[PDB]
Amino acid sequence: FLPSAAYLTHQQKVLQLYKRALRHLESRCVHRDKYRYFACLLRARFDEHKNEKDMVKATQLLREAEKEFWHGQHPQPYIFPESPGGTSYERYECYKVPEWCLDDWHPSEKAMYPDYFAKREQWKKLRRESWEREVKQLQEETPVGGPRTEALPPARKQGDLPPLWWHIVTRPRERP
């Protein structure tokens, strides 16, 4: 369930296991120095059988490693206050008013803010002028009838903006 590929990798799965076990050992192990000791012990335990030339033995050790990890996890791991489940986790989703709005104002409030609305007008002209031919030709020129991936190509032909940029550039500041 990832945008660029279908399966992660074997190495990617071992690597996610390593980051999750190291994070849970952070949360388990306070005072940071016994943490550093146990983290180097874990790094050594990965080093002792990292260089095995098989593949079914690699997935064997991976599967038993998930067993002996899920035995020893921590109930409330220290997740950061931006991660899902965290303390904040879009705390300031109260104030992410999107920018398809702000055009439905009365013109007196538009007369209070001259320069920002003039520059929004020139950005909106830049959106409307460079939408049809360039973006739709690059989106209906390079793909096959099945796209088979979600990475979209940059604009490297001659000039202007990359395709499908508007609701990725004009997103809110995430600390308004």
Partner 1 sequence: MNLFSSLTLVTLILLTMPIAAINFNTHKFTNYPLYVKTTISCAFITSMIPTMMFIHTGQEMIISNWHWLTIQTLKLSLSFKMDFFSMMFVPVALFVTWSIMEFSMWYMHSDPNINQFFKYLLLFLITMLILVTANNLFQLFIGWEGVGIMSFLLIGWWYGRTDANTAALQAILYNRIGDIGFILAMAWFLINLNTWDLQQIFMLNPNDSNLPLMGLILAATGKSAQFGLHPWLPSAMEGPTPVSALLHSSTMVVAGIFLLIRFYPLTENNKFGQSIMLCLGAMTTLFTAMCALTQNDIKKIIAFSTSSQLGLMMVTIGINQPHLAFLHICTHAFFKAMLFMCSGSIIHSLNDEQDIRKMGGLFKAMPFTTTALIIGSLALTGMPFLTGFYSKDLIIESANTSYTNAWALLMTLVATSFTAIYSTRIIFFALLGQPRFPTLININENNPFLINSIKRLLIGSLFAGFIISNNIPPMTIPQMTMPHYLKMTALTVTILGFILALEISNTTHYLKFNYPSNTFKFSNLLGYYPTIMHRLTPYMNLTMSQKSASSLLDLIWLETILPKTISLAQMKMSTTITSQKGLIKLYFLSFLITILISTTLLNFHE
Partner 2 sequence: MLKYIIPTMMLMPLTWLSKNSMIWINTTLHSLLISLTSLLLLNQFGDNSLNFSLTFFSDSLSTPLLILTMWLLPLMLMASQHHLSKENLARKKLFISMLILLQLFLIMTFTATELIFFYIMFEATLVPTLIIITRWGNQTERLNAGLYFLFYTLAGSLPLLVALIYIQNTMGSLNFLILQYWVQPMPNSWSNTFMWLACMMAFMVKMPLYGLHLWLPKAHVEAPIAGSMVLAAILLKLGGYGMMRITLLLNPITDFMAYPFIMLSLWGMIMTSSICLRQTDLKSLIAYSSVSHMALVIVAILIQTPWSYMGATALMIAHGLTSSMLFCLANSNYERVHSRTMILARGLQTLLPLMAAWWLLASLTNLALPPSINLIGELFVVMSTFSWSNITIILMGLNMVITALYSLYMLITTQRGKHTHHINNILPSFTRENALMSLHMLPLLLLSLNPKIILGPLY
Partner 3 sequence: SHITKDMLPGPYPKTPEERAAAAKKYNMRVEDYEPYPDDGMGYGDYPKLPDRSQQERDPWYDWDHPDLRLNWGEPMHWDLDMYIRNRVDTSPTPVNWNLMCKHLFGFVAFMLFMFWVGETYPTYQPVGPKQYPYNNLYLERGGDPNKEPEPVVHYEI
Where does this chain bind partner 3 (CB under 8 A)?
A: 1-3, 73, 75, 84
Binding mask 1-20 for partner 1 (x = CB under 8 A): --------------------
Nearest in space to 87 (alpha carbons), one of 99, 79, 95 = 79
Query: Cβ 100 to partner 2, closest distance in Å?
Result: 4
The interface with partner 1 within residues 70-89 (CB under 8 A) comprises 71-72, 75-76, 78, 80-81, 87-89
Minimal distance, residue 79 CB to partner 1, in Å: 9
Asked if residue 161 lies in contact with residue 155, where contact means CB atoms within 8 angstroms, the answer is yes
**Binding residue for partner 1 (CB under 8 A) from 13, 20, 22, 27?**
27
CA distance 13 to 20: 11
Measure the CA–CA gap between 32 and 66, rounded to whole angstroms: 24
Q: Is 102 left (phi over 0), alpha (psi -120 to 50) or beta?
A: left
Residues in touch with partner 1 (CB under 8 A)? 26-34, 37-38, 71-72, 75-76, 78, 80-81, 87-95
